[PDB]
Amino acid sequence: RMSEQGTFALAKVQVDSERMKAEEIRWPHLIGTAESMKQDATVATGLDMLYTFVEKAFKDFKVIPGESEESKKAAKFIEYCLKNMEGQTLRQFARDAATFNEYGLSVVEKVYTQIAVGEYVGKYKVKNLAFRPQASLSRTNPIVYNSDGSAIVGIKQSLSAFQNYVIIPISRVMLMNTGGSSSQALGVSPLVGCYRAWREKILIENLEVVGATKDMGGVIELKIPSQILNKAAMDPSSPEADMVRGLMSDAANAHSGEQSFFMLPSDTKDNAPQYSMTLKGIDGMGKQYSTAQLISDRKKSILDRLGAGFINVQTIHTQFVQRVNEIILEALNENLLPQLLALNDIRLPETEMPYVKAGEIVDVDMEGFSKAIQRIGAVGYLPKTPKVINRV
Amino acid sequence: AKAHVATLEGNYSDIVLGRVVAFGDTGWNFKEVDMTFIADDADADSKTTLFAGVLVGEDGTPATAAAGVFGVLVDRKVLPGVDHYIGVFEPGEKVPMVLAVRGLTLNQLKLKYADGTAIDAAGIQALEAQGNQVTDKIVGTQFIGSVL
């Protein structure tokens, strides 16, 4: 019949998922663990390359109208509104929206304003797609639900963000999340999974630096009878003291050059000699684990989650970028455009709704495209329209 | 039947509200001395009577008079909720303890003598002489009264 018989259980699916995580990556802490990651030169690089193509796609965007004359007028007004935000551009919005690859979540608030003077005087633009940083949100409950765990009523922002050195209704907010189903409000950050590998990768690099510094192979060792050493310590103005002070400086400066040599007395008291000079070496076998290949495995382990693992040497990286683009477009096409047209009472059928199409992330091949037009053109399957002509 | 349950209330910041942080040695405000952790003549599992906020003289023994006060015990080993050092030390054994001496914004109400008696005016003078500000007002809290 026409009646729901269950709940999405948003408030339970979360509370199981916070337990099943290591405690350094639960909500109020993940905000710090993200920014204490990134400073790894493989983690920054993966995120930077992802944002490189996201910005490119949302630079040369287009709005595709319908067939009727009404849709064409609506498409022009949509393009004006999206290209005339006061102090904002879609590239800035795209690079703010794509932050859910770091925190599983992204919050944008829609603000509308009236036009004073212009082509569309009397209508409503969008002033700013105000980004709400994840760090300024509520650390206790960020997202508030019904009396039951069925739906979401709004998002809470901390009171400490209104200071220099509140609950926003859900209808005003555009939510984007990734890595989880529709029942996970706090999405799974792609850095979850990487975390254990990042912890190991760091530790190994630390061992390499201290290990290389402490490999005192070939160090110089000198043996002197203790009679001379003891006499110098108690008689600072004795000939033994002068020679000991000379050794402490001469041995420090003992390099290899044009005049390097050693001259020692050859006296002998027992099976061992009184004076000797030998260069030390590891009496046995050295290290075995070859920490170099340990790090390489963990680096490929981290970059694979971001689709940027090819730097260790249609593709995987290009397909990964398309995922981020489609998530943003769904919010833009289905949450802002229908509401924006409602304010200016432009009510159209489903088939006449214009939509925004993102740009292409891979450049067109001049060699391939030019010879593709000929092959289609030489048969006559290519229409004669200004759309085809303008493509050159 | 009985349900063995406990509460983990307590905090550290309540004894030290603020610090002057030197850009050089960050330990300028502290000093370490060897106090007695377990009671000298008690049994092997007689947990320490020391509590965070007890005044300690420079000799290391807990203060008993205003004239014998030199600092405040703020050691991590005595803080609430982490006092698991039960039976880990022999009776009368010594252990280094961290003392807060200078550059602190302390809380007056949590300073007490060895027996738990609150600090007096002479103790306030002696402790402030090092360069400490002993505040007399923390807001406090009322949790649930059904009225306020």
Binding site: V15, E18, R19, K21, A22, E23, E24, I25, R26, W27, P28, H29, L30, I31, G32, A135, S138, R139, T140, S158, L159, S160, F162, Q163, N164, Y165 | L8, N11, Y12, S13, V16, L17, G18, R19, V21, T26, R76, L79, G81, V82, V139, T141, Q142, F143, I144, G145, V147, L148
Partner: protein, 330 residues
């Protein structure tokens, strides 16, 4: 979640409780907000009237008029700071107390402190209006202002006492005669039909309803607002009652002393005002004040985090004449 060394257990959920915070006075919107620049304010009064003319003989002496009256006052504003700090030991090895194994995060403690500071500021603001309505400013431990408006302006406190133990006497016949007569004779301007409101402690409001007169008034025929079978104010926590062109409200907060009630009229211009002054910062100095300031600082040496919040405002009642201390006897 871990049970004894060799056993485990299942974690179930979290339970949280907090005391109620009242907002009735905030809801009624009886206070106008002014955002100044300095910490001193001026108020100007100008009171005028007329006299009586006596008869005199024709062609002889004449009669002369008097002159008007003026007054000027000044006031100061108090200050209210609130600070806290966070140390490593508070999060070093303490489990989050939420999920089974999530380590403690600084952000959670920061949010807790934000919530506590906001609640404290709201409670202080609530108490300020109650103190102002009683005819005195709110500034505990700060004798710098301690302004008693009755003394400052010059006035007296009308009582309008009522006794409920007299079942044969309707209490409203004293409230009307005293309070409404005094308010009408002291409105100052030339108005009409001023609306009257009453704030009553739980005991006073509860006793008033039980009086036989009120019950007998509505019992014999339905009318509307069925006291006997419905609940005053519906299911809301704050009961509401209206009898004899008067509005009665119960004070859940308990700030009003038990058994006491204050009667004051609505609509009168500029009877209540609240002023805000800037904070002690170079950014806000000599600037326009704001409702509340919150600051947060993370130590650049990674070994400290601090939170700071401050505010400064004053509540002023411009007419002590129109507040009556109703007192009940039982």
């Amino acid at each position: 979640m871990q049970n004894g060394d060799f056993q485990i257990l299942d974690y179930t959920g979290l339970i949280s409780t907090m005391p109620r915070v009242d907002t009735l006075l905030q809801s009624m919107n009886l206070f106008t907000e002014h955002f100044g620049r300095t910490t001193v304010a001026r108020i100007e009064r100008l009171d005028d009237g007329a006299g009586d003319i006596k008869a005199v003989q024709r062609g002889g002496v004449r009669q002369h008029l008097a002159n008007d009256r003026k007054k000027i006052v000044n006031l100061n504003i108090p200050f209210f700071p609130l600070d806290r700090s966070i140390d490593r030991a508070d999060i070093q090895n303490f489990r989050e107390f939420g999920t089974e194994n999530a380590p403690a995060t600084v952000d959670a403690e920061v949010q807790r402190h934000m919530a506590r500071i906001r609640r404290s500021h709201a409670i202080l603001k609530s108490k300020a209006m109650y103190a102002a309505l009683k005819g005195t400013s709110w500034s505990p431990d700060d004798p710098v202002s301690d302004y008693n408006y009755y003394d400052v302006w010059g006035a007296t406190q009308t009582t309008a006492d009522v006794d409920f133990t007299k079942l044969g006497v309707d209490p409203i016949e004293v409230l009307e005669a005293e309070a409404r007569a005094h308010i009408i004779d002291w409105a100052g301007d030339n108005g009409d039909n001023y609306e009257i409101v009453v704030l009553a402690s739980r005991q006073w409001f509860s006793a008033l309803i039980a009086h036989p007169q009120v019950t007998g008034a509505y019992s014999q025929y339905p009318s509307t607002q069925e006291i006997l079978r419905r609940r005053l104010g519906g299911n809301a926590n704050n009961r509401i009652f209206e009898h004899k062109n008067i509005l009665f409200i119960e004070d859940i907060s308990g700030n009003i002393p038990a058994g006491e009630a204050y009667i004051f009229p609505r609509g009168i211009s500029r009877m209540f005002e609240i002023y805000y002054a800037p904070s002690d910062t170079l950014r806000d100095a000599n600037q326009a004040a704001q409702e509340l300031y919150v600051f947060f600082k993370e130590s650049n040496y990674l070994r400290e985090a601090k939170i700071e919040s401050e505010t400064s405002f004053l509540t002023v009642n411009n007419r002590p004449e129109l507040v009556v201390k109703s007192t009940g006897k039982f």
